[PDB]
Amino acid sequence: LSAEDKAAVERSKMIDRNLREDGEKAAREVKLLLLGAGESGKSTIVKQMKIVKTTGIVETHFTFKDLHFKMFDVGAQRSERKKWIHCFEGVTAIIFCVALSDEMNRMHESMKLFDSICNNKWFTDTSIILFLNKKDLFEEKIKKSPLTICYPEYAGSNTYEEAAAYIQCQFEDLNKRKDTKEIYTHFTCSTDTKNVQFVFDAVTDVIIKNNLKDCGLF
Amino acid sequence: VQLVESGGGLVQPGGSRKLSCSASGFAFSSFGMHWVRQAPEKGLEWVAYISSGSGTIYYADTVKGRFTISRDDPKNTLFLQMTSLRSEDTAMYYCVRSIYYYGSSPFDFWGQGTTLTVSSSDIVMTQATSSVPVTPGESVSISCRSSKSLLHSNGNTYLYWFLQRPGQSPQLLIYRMSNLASGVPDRFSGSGSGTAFTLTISRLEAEDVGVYYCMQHLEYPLTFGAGTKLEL
Amino acid sequence: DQLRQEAEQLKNQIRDARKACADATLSQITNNIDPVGRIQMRTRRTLRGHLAKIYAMHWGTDSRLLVSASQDGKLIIWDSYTTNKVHAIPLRSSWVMTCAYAPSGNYVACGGLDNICSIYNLKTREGNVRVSRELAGHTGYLSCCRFLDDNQIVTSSGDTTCALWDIETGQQTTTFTGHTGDVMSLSLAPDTRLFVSGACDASAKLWDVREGMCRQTFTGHESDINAICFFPNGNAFATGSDDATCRLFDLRADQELMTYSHDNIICGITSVSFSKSGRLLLAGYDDFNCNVWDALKADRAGVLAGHDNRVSCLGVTDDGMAVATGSWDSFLKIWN
Amino acid sequence: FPMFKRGRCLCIGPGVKAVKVADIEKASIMYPSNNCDKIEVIITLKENKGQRCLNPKSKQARLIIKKVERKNF
Amino acid sequence: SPPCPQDFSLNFDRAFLPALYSLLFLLGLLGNGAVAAVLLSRRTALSSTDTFLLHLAVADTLLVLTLPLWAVDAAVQWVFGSGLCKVAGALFNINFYAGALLLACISFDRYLNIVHATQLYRRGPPARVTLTCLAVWGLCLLFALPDFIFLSAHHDERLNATHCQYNFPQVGRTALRVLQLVAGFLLPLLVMAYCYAHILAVLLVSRGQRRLRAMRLVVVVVVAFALCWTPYHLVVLVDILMDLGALARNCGRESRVDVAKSVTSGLGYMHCCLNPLLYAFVGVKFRERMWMLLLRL
Amino acid sequence: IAQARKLVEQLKMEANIDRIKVSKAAADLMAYCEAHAKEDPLLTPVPASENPFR
Ligand SMILES: CC(C)CCC[C@@H](C)[C@H]1CC[C@H]2[C@@H]3CC=C4C[C@@H](O)CC[C@]4(C)[C@H]3CC[C@]12C
Ligand SMILES: CC(C)CCC[C@@H](C)[C@H]1CC[C@H]2[C@@H]3CC=C4C[C@@H](O)CC[C@]4(C)[C@H]3CC[C@]12C
């Protein structure tokens, strides 16, 4: 049978229970993937964190209403995005940051990145939380320069809120899978807790939908 | 890494004591722990074993019922609570760590031992030779014999060779009849077959003298057998 | 300009020089040797305990212990004869995409999206595994790593460069540049005198460990190369890519020898390894199963199915007893 | 539910005194059961035009049940 | 004047119950065995509702497997002695109670998943599913114990055959019917109504596109259970009351109540056979798992 | 410009290889596969007595 292989088996079983406990403790975490183009307001989003050695990935922990959130920043990779994106196939949500105050057609690059990410074959069934940052500079620039420069087919006035809604819907209709996934949109404000509350509400909604799919409904 | 023992002294028969073994410098939670006994001017004798996580506990037949081994991992301490002390329990007690996985070396580190004095085993292993006169220029062979085939069905022969220098605690020389322990000079070697085993020393020095023991780890009683003495 | 013309004429001369050596082909030479039978393999063990996609694995040199790395930030060392977990290392970064096991057996390695190759020491006096080194200096994700002599290690990253390190000092002994895309895999020669790297520029390069120079460059693939493996002879290698084909190249002939493709396979290849004698070629695919090809005939000799997700890692023991395959469903299977 | 089928009280109400002699074509004298706890007596008429119950309150029912219980068992 | 013969009841029994029982047996085995096979192969990483669904499938399978013995009983007589009487009765009662309690437990688990989503996400006990299942099965055994011991194959003198029935008097019959009614209809229905009302409120407040299908499925489940298992309990309650409260004792009442009891028991068995259709095959995850088992293997 | 010069140097050094006919390399691979045929447990499965995996 076994002479001192029983002690090896007992050690293996203790390792098993420790692994299971670690998995249970790690399954109660919210993992969000933070994406954007050219530091377009990522900093003003990460500044709501309340908890050169490593230049590959950035971790961010915080806690809101006893819920623990993990955010991953991958803006310093510069590699082929298709070679490592599948690592994040199971994140709860993708927080996508877009700077509203746009000038060298950066909005087209942001739209291209959003189109690639949203219709990616790994991120089906993954929700997106859109953050339209820098609305005051947008106010100022739209007061000076209209939106027609960036989008020539703008048939509306130079009013701030209607043009902002135009930008929002023109981002949101890039979602080819209008029924598989949902897009949550927000205009970042100086108030500290509004962004975190919006993220909390979006994560609660996506958790409820995931449980609807898992618990046999839908 | 060190194991430090406390709780020895003189005790009247029928009393009770609690020996403590404090461990520092290693992951105490990952190592199984043994209490071993050495009677004055006699061989080693296994006493108790507690697993890692306190899962399994084993006692010797001669100490079962009146002894209790336990561990407290947050404080890194090992207790032996002994009761109904007879006059045959006067000895020195050693605290030994032993970790078991594939390719490990159990019994590698021994504590210093604490002395306890009291006022007025289906495998037996025989070391027929009791003393050997040597000079520090030759090769010495020490033979050990078992009453059972120590070779197991998985190809492992469970024989361990320990060395006890005068005034010190035994140290692991060889584990599983062929493997040298860490920090052991290459001059030592071991071999054997099933029931007859041999330890070989190529060129001795002044620090190769002492008492040599051959323990078995096949069936758990873990008998030792009286050692062989090398002097001069 | 005055140098692009020089490069073009040199490339044309190289193509002509390697065109004159193709007197025959490996297929029409092997046409008269007995084909191997239907290779049917049985799953002896299934190793459970990983809770996420398994991205890498590596056999021990004794061909009994193996190391596996999963995306849940865990390294597990398994004794394959009994399926016991010898060690379970928790990693600082959960995003690990490679692992290696030292030839001596004393150290293991990891790397991934944190651009750091971590070296862990298994034989410690404290009784637990603790990190021995953190080699940093790459600017992209680590894609592979291979211990060389227990004190130096070759790594490859997504910054289109490979490197050879010195673990004692922690600094790059050598840097290998010349690729254009991400370097996705490397394979050491049996004598550890050379190695091969396959990149996302659909090319492979043969580097010399000393002198840090590229001996030869091999092309022929259509898309990114994901796997590579030396022939046991050490005079040839095989590459798998995203165009659902494998290629066997020869070092001395300095050109392609054979291709392994099928009309029913359209998914890319994730891993490649050879058999003990080099007669069989094992390849893992995205269609959830592995394929055993005849290395001399280029026709499938077997199929290893039983994984519920993409097969991501694949290895063969040093004595040829078993084949370990790990997939994205968090299981490893030993086949024999 | 097939385990709850039970023999309900066949005769509803006390047995009738409309007794006429020389009508013995079938007569069942059966014990009180576990469901309906009352020994009951059924006797048919000619041409099976009606099977009437005899209440034990009448003397002839007592006589018939006592001789059946003492004889047939 | 006649001994109010319950003839038409037994003739209708022999006419209809054998074929109905056989058809229900075949359908129940097919569906519940398919569900249990799909769930058992990929037994690893089962959700809580999937574990409850597997237990419910097992219980319904055992019920419909016991059913053909009662089909034979309804056919001619009982020719299986008393040990089979006891075993079959205990199995039937255990399976019925387990089905009701597991439906209630599925409803409660869905309530916990949907209403208290966040709290259960960050504070969810890992070993509550097995505890709930074991408690359900143990309580079912404790409920079936009186059936498990008082059963017997009695030769009914009131009848003209032998049937597997009980030995305690009619007051015990009233008590056991009351317990069956309460613990198999009222408590499960109340728990389902409460939990699914809260689920419906939460799904109405929120926004999306799958919430419509979720609300439709919730309403279908509640209505299906109520319609399937309500008439039998009304017939049983009418029988109990007519035994004591509303006498009205004549042949018409007995014949009507018996035929109603038979057809409504058929309805209940139909629900037990039909549970997999609206608890397993309406979820996309189960269908994907089933296809991964079927096509790929 | 230095990239072109480095590439030209690399190509010049790579175009100085003592090549070998493809037939000879094929024959060498065939010979190696033939010589070690008996030592391949996957190619020629060994009996269950000395199979460490069961
Ligand atoms: C399931 C367990 C844990 C609960 C208790 C089990 C007991 C009460 C049950 C289980 C199986 C039952 C037995 C099954 C069948 C028969 C044959 C019958 O002719 C007499 C009763 C007898 C012998 C039963 C007696 C009670 C019994 C032993
Ligand atoms: C003889 C009868 C009356 C008493 C025994 C009751 C039987 C039918 C019940 C009691 C406990 C039940 C088991 C409880 C738990 C499990 C594990 C689950 O993964 C599959 C179903 C299974 C295996 C159940 C099958 C049915 C079961 C065995």
Residue numbers in the entry:
A (entry chain A): 5 to 55, 179 to 229, 239 to 354
B (entry chain S): 2 to 121, 136 to 247
C (entry chain B): 5 to 340
D (entry chain L): 1 to 73
E (entry chain R): 40 to 336
F (entry chain G): 9 to 62
Task: Please quote the authors directly.
CXCR3 belongs to the class A G-protein-coupled receptor (GPCR) family. Following activation, CXCR3 couples to Gi heterotrimer or β-arrestin to initiate intracellular signals of T cells that express the receptor, causing T cell activation and migration toward the inflamed tissue.
The CXCR3–CXCL11–DNGi complex was obtained by coexpression of CXCR3-LgBit, CXCL11, DNGαi and Gβγ-HiBit, and further stabilized by adding a single chain variable antibody fragment scFv16 after purification by affinity chromatography. The N terminus (residues 1–8) of CXCL11, known as the chemokine site 2 (CS2), inserts deeply into the central binding pocket (chemokine recognition site 2, CRS2) of CXCR3. The FPMF motif in the proximal N terminus of CXCL11 adopts a torsional posture in the bottom of the pocket, with the side chain of Phe1CXCL11 inserted most deeply (right). Therefore, the FPMF motif in CXCL11 plays a key role in receptor activation. Following the FPMF motif, the KRGR motif of CXCL11 stretches along the upper pocket through extensive charge–charge interactions (right), including the salt bridges between Lys5CXCL11 and Asp521.31, Arg6CXCL11 and Asp2826.62, Arg8CXCL11 and Glu2937.28. Mutation of Asp521.31, Asp2826.62 and Glu2937.28 to alanine results in 69-, 8.6- and 85-fold increase in the half-maximum effective concentration (EC50) of CXCL11, suggesting that the salt bridge interactions between the KRGR motif and the receptor are crucial for CXCL11-induced receptor activation. In detail, the hydrogen bond interaction between Asn35CXCL11 and Arg2125.35 positions the 30s loop of CXCL11 on the top of ECL2. In detail, CXCL11 binding disturbs the hydrophobic packing between TM3 and TM6 contributed by Phe1313.32, Phe1353.36, Phe2646.44 and Trp2686.48, resulting in the packing of Phe2646.44 against Phe2245.74 and Leu2285.51.
